Design a protein around this nucleic acid. Structure first.
Ligand SMILES: Nc1nc2c(ncn2[C@@H]2O[C@H](COP(=O)(O)OP(=O)(O)OP(=O)(O)O)[C@@H](O)[C@H]2O)c(=O)[nH]1
Ligand SMILES: Nc1ncnc2c1ncn2[C@@H]1O[C@H](COP(=O)(O)OP(=O)(O)OP(=O)(O)O)C[C@H]1O
Ligand SMILES: [Mg+2]
Ligand SMILES: [Zn+2]
Ligand SMILES: [Zn+2]
Ligand SMILES: [Zn+2]
Lengths: 65, 49, 1105, 46, 34
RNA sequence: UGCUCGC
C-alpha cells in the first residue's frame, strides 16, 4: 500500500527516501545508480525500495474525497 | 409380524425447530410420514363410509 | 551452421492475449449467447397457440436484453454498477423484453416493448457497463481495472460457471466390458433425443442393445429390417477379409436358424421385441411393424439421418461399426476414454442457452394452459395473454439456477450439480486461476484413478502441474496460458468442399469398397461423409484451403491410418492451440514479421490470414509434427512451438524456475498460491466481503516470470521479499518449520489485515409492523451506556472507529412477536470473537421491500506469531517455530541479519534446486538493481548471476562469511543468504485455535456440536476408539465415550424390561421394579428408535455384584 | 437528535430521521455510510 | 431469584462458549447448558 | 444439504 518507514532486516530509515527515489526515476537515473546515490550500500534497502509497489495513489483514486 | 398399530415415537426423536423468521417450522421426515399415514387412514375410512 | 532463431518470437504471445486468452472465453461465449443464440431460441418457438378456439395465436417478433438496470425505483429503471449490486445484496441483471403480436378478439394487437424476464449480465460482457471503460471510469464506478470479470453477481454474491468437460457425442467407442467382451457403444445425440446403443459379442455373435428394445436382437436381423435383405451384401458391407468372414459366420448361422429372410419378417420380429411406453395415449391400430420401423429410422442412430425411410447410410454406419468391432476383437486396439481428442468443453454460453430454451418452453406451455383454461368459458371479454404473462418465471429460474448451482432440465433429462461456484476472493491470483477452471464429468465420488492420470493429450491445452491437492486431484484442471475453445460452424462449405474434392457418395457403391486397403472413410461430426482414395491429397488441399481463408480456421481434419478414417470436426468445444507453420525446414514467421508486429504494422489476425500461424486441434496435432525449438526442426516438421513456457497455466506461472523443481512441489505451490494472502484490487477498500485478507506492505517479486508480467501480477503482489538464510538454528526448524526475526516482525514484516462482514436486515412483515433499532440502554446509575451497549451510537448502530470486544452488540435489533399493541423482543447482533475488532465502515442501504440492510466491516490487525503458515513460492510450506530477537540472529560482515531461517534438510528429499536458483537470481538482482526472470524452460542462467555476484564483490555461490550472533564466533561453514519471495497463507493459528468447555449440545443426540462456529467439541472417531481398545484403557474409554459425552440416568423396569420415567413404569402401572441406570444418551435414543421399529429391546437388569 | 450520514458519491452530510427512505439530495444514490465517531480511541504502536 | 442468597441479579453471561444464567451477587450458577 | 479448503 505505502512505503514502510523501517527496513525489515536492518532497520534503516527508508520511508523518507521514496519520493526522492521517484525523482531519480523522473530524472535519467536508472535503478542501480539511483539506489547507490541514495546511500543504500547493503542490498536489503535496495530490495526494499526496488520491490516496493506504490499502491497508495491507486487506492486514493477510489477514496471518497 | 403383521402390524395393525403404529408406535409414533416421542418428540425427543423428532426435533422441531421454530423458525420465527418465516411462517413455518422445520420438522423431520418421520413427522411428515406419520401425518401422511394418518391422512391415508382417514381417506380409507371416508371411502369405506 | 546453426539454423537462425527468431528471438522476438515470444512477442506473438501477448498479441494473442489482446483478443483471446485467459478470461475472453466466457465473455465471448456469453456474448454469442445473448446476441445470436437467444434469437435462434426465440425463432424456434416464435409461435405458440392453443388447440381450443382456433385462429388464436401468440407470435414473438424480436427479443432484446438491453442494459443492466435495477427495479428499486417505483416502476422506473435506473443504471446500477456491479459494485452497487455487491453492496445492496441484489442481482446484476438486465430486463429481457420482447415485441409481440397476438389476437384478443380476432383483432391483431401488437406490443413493441413488453418485458418478460431478467437475464443476469456477466461482467465485462457486451451489455455490461464495465466494458469500453477507462481505468478512471472504473474508479468512478468503484471497480478494479485489473479485475478479470466474466462472473455473475446474484443477490450480492459472485458466482462463476465452471467449464464443463464431457465425452464427445455421436462417436463410436470400442471398449471392453466387465467380462472382458470387447463391444461397441454409440451415443447418438441430436438436438432432441440422446440414445446410447451398444453392440456385444457375448456369444461369438453380435447383438444390438437399446433402451427401447426388450431383448437384444442379432445384428443380421436389423440389417434385413433396414432394407438390405441379401446376406452377400451384408458380408460385403462388413468386410471381405477372411478373418472377418470367419468371425461373422456365427451371426449368419444364427440368422439362418430362424425364418427371417425378408424386411417384413425382420420388422415383425423387432416389433415383437418392442414394449409400449406404459400405455401410450391413442389407438395403436396395428402399429407393431410401424413402431419397429420408426424406432429403426428415428430412435436408433439419431445422428445418422435417413432422407425418406432410406437406411442406406445407417446400414453403412452399422457395418463400419461391426467391422471395427471385428478388427478390435483381434489385436487389443481398444480406444481410451481419457484421450482429450474425444473431449468437449461446454462454457457458460451453451448451458445458459439450454436453460433459456427450457425456461421459454415452460413459459409457452404455461401460457397455452392458461389460454385453454380462460378463453372458452370466461365471458365475452376477450382473453389476452398480456394480463397473464408472468415476468417472474424466467427471472426466478435464472436466479435459482445460477445461485444454487443445480440444473434440472426435464426436456433433456439433465440433472447436474456444482455448475456454479462462489468466486474465491483470497487474492487476485486465486480469482484469476479459478476463472479458468475445468471440472470433469466424472463428478468425483469414488476412486476412479482412470481420468485422474495426466494424459499426454493435455499438451499445450491444460496445465499439467496445476491441480487441487486432495480428493479432487486430477478431476479439476486449469487451462494453459495460450489456449482457445472453438465454437460451432455452419458446416455448409465443409460439405461443399468435400463433395467437390472427389469424395464419392456412399450410396453409389456397395460396402465391399469399404474393405479395400487404399479406400479411406471420411466422416463429419460422426456422420459418414463418404469414401476417398489418396487421402493425402484431400488432407493437404483441405488444410491449404483452411489456411487460405475459404474454410474456417477452427475446422479440424485428422487421419487415422489404423482404422483408415478421415475425421472432419467442426463442432464447438474443441481445444485448439496456435502453431507456427513450418515449410521445408524453415518457419513461415521471420524476424521482419516480428518487427512489424512490434511496430504495430500487423496483429495476430494478420498472422492468421497470411498462412503464418494456424490453430491445431488435438486430433489434428496427433498427425502433425511439432518442433519445440528452431534447432529441433528436421526435414519432417510441419509446425513450430510458439513458446514452451505456455504449457503451464496461470497459477503455475508464478513459480520461478519451475523446471528445476519436482512436480509435487509445483502442485503444492499452485495450491498454496491459490490461498496466498495479498491485495485483491484497487477497489479493495470500498469492497465489503464476508472475509478478506490484505497485506500491510506487499512487494513485487524480484524473480518474476514473463507470465507475471502478462497477468499484471506485479501490480497486485501477494507476498514479500525477505532476506532468507538457509541454515539450521536452535533446532526449532526441524521439520519444515522456519525461524522468524522479532525485529523484522516489529518493523512491519508479515503484518496482515483481516476484514470481516457483519450484516443485519430490518424487514417489513405482512402486517404493518417493522423491525426497529432501539437506542443504547443507558445505565441510570452512571448516565452512560452499559458495557454491552457501549459502542452503539445514538441510533443504536455501532459507529466506525471504535474497538469491539467479545459479547458486544453491533446493532440493537428488536423484532415484533405478533408477526393489540406490538410486542418487541430483542435479537441483537452480538460479536463472537476471541480478539478485539475495529469497525472500519458501516453501510446502510434500503431495498425495494423497505428492508434496511446494515453491513459493518470489522478490521483486525494481526502480527506473525507462532503457528502462522508461510510459503516460499516453491511448495515449501512452513510454520513459524520460534521468534528469536535480532541480536540472536547471525550477522554477516555487512551487518545484515536474516528475517527467515529455513531448514536445509527440506532440500535433499524434495530436490528444490529452483529455490536456490531463485535465491541467487534475486540476490544478483538486488545487487545490480535488476529484475531477473525465472521463465519456464529458460530465464536467466546461473553463469550470468554468478558474474553479477563476482562483479559486486560478493561470493559467486551465495555462501557468505557469517559470524554467530549468540557466541560471537564465526561459523565453520558459510551460510546461504539471499532474498526469497515468501508469501503468507490464510491459515492462521488464531482462527484455528479451539477449546471446548461443557458448552451446548444437540437436541436430537445430546452431544457436542460439529463446528467451531457452532462451539463444537472434538470427536473421538472409530480409529481413536480402536487405539484406546488396543491400549487396554477401559476406564479412560468409558470416561470419554460415556461420562464426558452423553451420560444420562434412565429408569428401567425390572419386570417388563422397558424404559420408565421418574421412577415409574407406565406399561406395568407399577413402580416397585423400576431402577435407575447410567447409560449413553445415544444408546437410549437407539432403544427408543428400535421400539418405534417394533424391535423391542427388553433389558434384564441385575446387581453389579 | 440530528443523525448524520454520508452519501456514496456526493459525500455530503445528510440528516435523516427514523423510518425514512434511504436517499440523498441532488442525486439518487442509495448507499449511505455512517460518519466516524467522536469518542477518543487509544491505539498501541506495537 | 438466586437459590442461595435470594438475590434477583440473575445475569446471562456466557463463559467460553457456555451459556449460563448465573447470579451476579454470590456467583451461584442458576442454569447452565443449552 | 451442497461446495472450496486445511494434512
Ligand atoms: N440445502 C441445504 N440443506 C441443508 C443446509 N443445512 C442442512 N441441510 C440439510 O439438513 C441435513 C443436515 O442438517 P443439520 O446441518 O444437522 O441441521 P442443523 O444444523 O441441526 O439445523 P439447526 O438446528 O437449525 O442448526 C442435511 O442432510 C442437509 O440436506 C443448508 O444450508 N442448505
Ligand atoms: N486424505 C488423507 N487421509 C489421511 N491423512 C492425510 C490425508 N491427507 C493428508 N493427510 C496427512 O498428511 C500427510 C501426507 O503427507 P505426505 O503425502 O507424506 O507428504 P506430501 O504431501 O507428499 O509432501 P511432498 O509432496 O512429498 O512435499 C500424512 C497424513 O497424516
Ligand atoms: Mg502435514
Ligand atoms: Zn535495509
Ligand atoms: Zn414394567
Ligand atoms: Zn449524494
Amino acid at each position: 500500500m505505502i512505503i514502510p518507514v523501517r527496513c525489515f532486516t536492518c532497520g534503516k530509515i527508508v520511508g523518507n527516501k521514496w519520493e526522492a527515489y521517484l525523482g531519480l526515476l523522473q530524472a535519467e537515473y536508472t535503478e542501480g545508480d539511483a539506489l547507490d546515490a541514495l546511500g543504500l550500500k547493503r542490498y536489503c534497502c535496495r530490495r526494499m525500495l526496488l520491490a516496493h509497489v506504490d499502491l497508495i495513489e491507486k487506492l486514493l483514486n477510489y477514496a471518497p474525497l | 409380524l403383521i402390524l395393525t398399530r403404529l408406535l409414533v415415537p416421542p418428540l425427543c426423536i423428532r426435533p422441531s425447530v421454530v423458525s420465527d423468521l418465516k411462517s413455518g417450522t422445520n420438522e423431520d421426515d418421520l413427522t411428515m410420514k406419520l401425518t401422511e399415514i394418518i391422512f391415508l387412514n382417514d381417506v380409507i375410512k371416508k371411502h369405506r363410509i | 551452421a546453426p539454423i537462425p532463431t527468431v528471438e522476438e518470437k515470444w512477442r506473438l504471445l501477448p498479441a494473442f492475449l489482446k483478443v483471446k486468452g485467459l478470461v475472453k472465453q466466457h465473455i465471448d461465449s456469453f456474448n454469442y449467447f445473448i446476441n445470436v443464440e437467444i434469437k435462434k431460441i426465440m425463432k424456434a418457438n416464435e409461435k405458440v397457440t392453443s388447440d381450443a378456439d382456433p385462429m388464436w395465436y401468440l407470435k414473438y417478433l424480436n427479443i432484446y436484453v438491453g442494459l443492466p438496470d435495477v427495479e428499486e425505483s417505483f416502476n422506473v429503471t435506473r443504471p446500477v454498477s456491479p459494485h452497487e449490486c455487491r453492496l445492496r445484496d441484489m442481482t446484476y441483471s438486465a430486463p429481457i423484453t420482447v415485441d409481440i403480436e397476438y389476437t384478443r378478439g380476432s383483432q391483431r394487437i401488437i406490443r413493441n416493448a413488453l418485458p418478460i424476464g431478467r437475464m443476469p449480465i456477466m461482467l465485462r460482457s457486451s451489455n455490461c457497463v464495465l466494458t469500453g471503460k477507462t481505468p478512471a471510469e472504473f474508479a468512478k464506478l468503484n471497480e478494479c481495472p485489473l479485475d478479470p470479470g466474466g462472473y455473475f453477481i446474484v443477490k450480492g454474491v459472485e458466482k462463476v460457471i465452471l467449464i464443463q468437460e464431457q465425452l464427445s457425442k455421436n462417436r463410436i467407442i470400442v471398449e471392453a466390458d466387465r467380462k472382458g467382451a470387447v463391444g461397441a457403444s454409440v451415443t447418438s445425440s441430436t438436438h432432441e433425443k440422446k440414445s446410447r446403443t451398444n453392440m456385444a459379442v457375448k456369444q461369438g455373435r453380435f447383438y444390438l442393445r437399446h433402451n427401447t428394445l426388450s431383448e437384444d436382437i442379432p445384428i443380421v436381423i436389423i440389417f434385413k429390417a433396414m432394407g438390405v435383405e441379401s446376406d452377400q451384401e451384408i458380408v460385403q458391407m462388413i468386410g471381405t477379409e477372411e478373418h472377418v468372414m470367419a468371425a461373422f459366420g456365427p451371426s449368419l448361422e444364427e440368422c439362418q436358424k430362424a425364418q427371417i429372410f425378408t424386411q417384413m419378417q425382420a420388422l415383425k420380429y423387432i416389433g415383437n421385441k418392442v414394449r409400449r411406453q406404459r400405455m401410450w395415449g391413442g389407438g395403436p391400430k396395428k402399429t407393431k411393424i410401424e413402431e419397429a420401423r420408426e424406432l429403426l429410422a428415428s430412435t436408433i442412430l439419431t445422428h445418422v439421418p435417413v432422407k425418406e425411410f432410406n437406411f442406406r447410410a445407417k446400414c453403412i454406419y452399422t457395418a463400419v461399426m461391426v467391422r471395427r468391432v471385428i478388427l478390435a476383437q483381434g489385436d487389443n486396439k481398444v480406444d481410451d476414454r481419457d484421450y482429450y481428442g474425444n473431449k468437449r468443453l461446454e462454457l457458460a454460453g451453451q448451458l445458459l442457452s439450454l436453460l433459456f430454451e427450457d425456461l421459454f418452453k415452460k413459459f409457452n406451455s404455461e401460457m397455452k394452459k392458461i389460454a385453454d383454461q380462460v378463453i372458452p368459458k370466461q365471458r365475452a371479454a376477450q382473453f389476452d395473454v398480456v394480463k397473464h404473462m408472468r415476468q417472474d418465471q424466467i427471472t426466478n429460474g435464472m436466479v435459482n439456477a445460477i445461485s444454487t448451482g443445480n440444473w434440472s432440465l426435464k426436456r433433456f433429462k439433465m440433472d447436474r450439480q456444482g455448475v456454479t461456484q462462489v468466486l474465491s476472493r483470497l487474492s487476485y491470483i486465486s480469482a484469476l486461476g479459478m476463472m479458468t477452471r475445468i471440472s470433469s464429468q466424472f463428478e468425483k465420488t469414488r476412486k476412479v484413478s482412470g481420468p485422474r492420470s495426466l494424459q499426454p493429450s493435455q499438451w499445450g491445452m491444460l496445465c499439467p502441474s496445476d491441480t487441487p491437492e486432495g480428493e479432487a486431484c486430477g478431476l479439476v484442471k486449469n487451462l494453459a496460458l495460450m489456449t482457445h475453445i472453438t465454437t460451432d460452424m455452419e458446416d455448409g462449405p465443409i460439405v461443399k468442399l468435400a463433395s467437390n474434392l472427389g469424395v464419392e457418395d456412399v450410396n453409389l457403391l456397395c460396402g465391399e469398397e469399404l474393405s479395400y486397403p487404399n479406400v479411406f472413410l471420411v466422416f463429419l461430426n460422426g456422420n459418414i461423409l463418404g469414401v476417398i482414395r489418396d487421402h493425402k491429397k484431400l488432407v493437404n488441399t483441405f488444410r491449404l484451403m483452411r489456411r487460405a481463408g475459404y474454410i474456417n480456421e477452427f475446422v479440424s481434419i485428422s487421419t487415422n491410418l489404423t482404422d483408415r478414417c478421415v475425421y472432419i470436426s467442426s463442432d464447438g468445444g474443441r481445444l485448439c492451440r496456435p502453431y507456427i507453420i513450418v515449410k521445408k525446414q524453415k518457419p513461415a514467421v521471420t524476424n521482419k514479421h516480428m518487427e512489424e508486429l512490434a511496430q504495430g504494422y500487423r496483429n495476430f489476425e494478420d498472422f492468421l490470414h497470411e498462412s503464418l500461424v494456424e490453430y491445431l486441434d488435438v486430433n489434428e496435432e496427433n498427425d502433425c509434427n511439432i518442433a519445440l525449438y528452431e534447432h529441433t526442426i528436421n526435414k519432417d516438421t510441419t509446425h513450430l512451438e510458439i513458446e514452451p513456457f505456455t504449457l503451464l497455466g496461470v497459477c503455475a506461472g508464478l513459480i520461478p524456475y519451475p523446471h528445476h523443481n519436482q512436480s509435487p512441489r509445483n502442485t503444492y505451490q499452485c495450491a498454496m498460491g491459490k490461498q496466498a494472502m495479498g491485495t485483491i484490487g484497487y477497489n479493495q477498500r470500498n469492497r465489503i466481503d464476508t472475509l478478506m485478507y490484505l497485506l500491510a506492505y506487499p512487494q513485487k517479486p524480484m524473480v518474476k516470470t514473463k507470465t507475471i508480467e502478462l497477468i499484471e501480477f506485479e501490480k497486485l503482489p501477494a507476498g514479500q521479499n525477505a532476506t532468507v538464510a538457509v541454515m539450521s538454528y536452535s533446532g526449532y526448524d526441524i521439520e519444515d518449520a522456519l525461524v522468524l526475526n522479532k525485529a523484522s516482525l516489529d518493523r512491519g514484516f508479515g503484518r496482515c489485515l483481516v476484514y470481516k462482514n457483519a450484516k443485519c436486515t430490518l424487514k417489513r412483515y405482512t402486517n404493518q409492523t417493522f423491525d426497529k433499532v432501539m437506542g443504547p440502554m443507558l445505565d441510570a446509575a452512571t448516565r452512560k451506556p452499559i458495557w454491552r451497549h457501549e459502542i452503539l451510537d445514538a441510533d443504536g448502530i455501532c459507529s466506525p472507529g471504535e474497538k469491539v470486544e467479545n459479547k458486544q452488540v453491533l446493532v440493537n435489533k428488536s423484532m415484533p412477536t405478533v408477526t393489540q399493541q406490538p410486542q418487541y423482543k430483542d435479537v441483537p447482533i452480538t460479536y463472537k470473537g476471541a480478539t478485539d475488532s475495529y469497525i472500519e465502515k458501516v453501510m446502510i442501504s434500503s431495498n425495494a421491500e423497505d428492508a434496511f440492510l446494515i453491513k459493518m466491516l470489522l478490521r483486525q490487525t494481526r502480527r506473525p506469531e507462532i503457528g502462522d503458515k508461510f510459503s516460499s513460492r516453491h511448495g515449501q510450506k512452513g510454520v513459524c517455530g520460534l521468534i528469536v530477537p535480532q541480536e540472536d540472529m547471525p550477522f554477516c560482515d555487512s551487518g545484515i541479519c536474516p528475517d527467515i531461517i529455513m531448514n536445509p534438510h527440506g532440500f535433499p528429499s524434495r530436490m528444490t534446486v529452483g529455490k536456490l536458483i531463485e535465491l541467487l537470481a534475486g540476490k544478483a538482482g538486488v545487487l545490480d538493481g535488476r529484475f531477473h526472470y525465472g521463465t519456464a524452460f529458460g530465464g536467466s542462467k546461473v553463469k550470468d548471476v554468478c558474474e553479477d555476484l563476482v562483479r559486486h564483490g560478493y561470493n559467486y555461490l551465495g555462501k557468505d562469511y557469517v559470524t554467530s550472533g549468540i557466541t560471537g564466533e564465526p561459523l565453520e561453514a558459510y551460510i546461504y543468504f539471499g532474498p526469497v519471495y515468501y508469501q503468507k497463507l490464510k491459515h492462521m493459528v488464531l482462527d484455528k485455535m479451539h477449546a471446548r468447555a461443557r458448552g451446548p449440545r444437540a437436541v436430537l443426540t445430546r452431544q457436542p456440536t460439529e463446528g467451531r462456529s457452532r462451539d463444537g467439541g472434538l470427536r473421538l472417531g472409530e480409529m481413536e476408539r480402536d487405539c484406546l481398545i488396543g491400549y487396554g484403557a477401559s476406564m479412560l474409554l468409558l470416561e470419554r465415550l460415556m461420562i464426558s459425552s452423553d451420560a444420562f440416568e434412565v429408569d428401567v423396569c425390572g419386570q417388563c424390561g422397558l424404559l420408565g420415567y421418574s421412577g415409574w413404569c407406565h406399561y406395568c402401572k407399577s413402580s416397585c421394579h423400576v431402577s435407575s441406570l447410567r447409560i449413553p444418551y445415544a444408546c437410549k435414543l437407539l432403544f427408543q428408535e428400535l421400539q418405534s421399529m417394533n424391535i423391542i429391546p427388553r433389558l434384564k437388569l441385575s446387581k453389579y455384584n | 437528535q440530528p443523525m448524520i450520514y454520508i452519501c456514496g458519491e456526493c459525500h455530503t452530510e445528510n440528516e435523516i430521521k427514523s423510518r425514512d427512505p434511504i436517499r440523498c439530495r441532488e442525486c439518487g444514490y442509495r448507499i449511505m455510510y455512517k460518519k466516524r465517531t467522536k469518542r477518543l480511541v487509544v491505539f498501541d504502536a506495537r | 431469584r438466586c437459590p442461595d442468597c435470594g438475590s434477583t441479579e440473575l445475569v446471562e453471561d456466557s463463559h467460553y462458549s457456555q451459556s449460563q444464567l448465573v447470579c451476579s451477587d454470590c456467583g451461584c450458577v442458576v442454569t447452565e447448558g443449552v
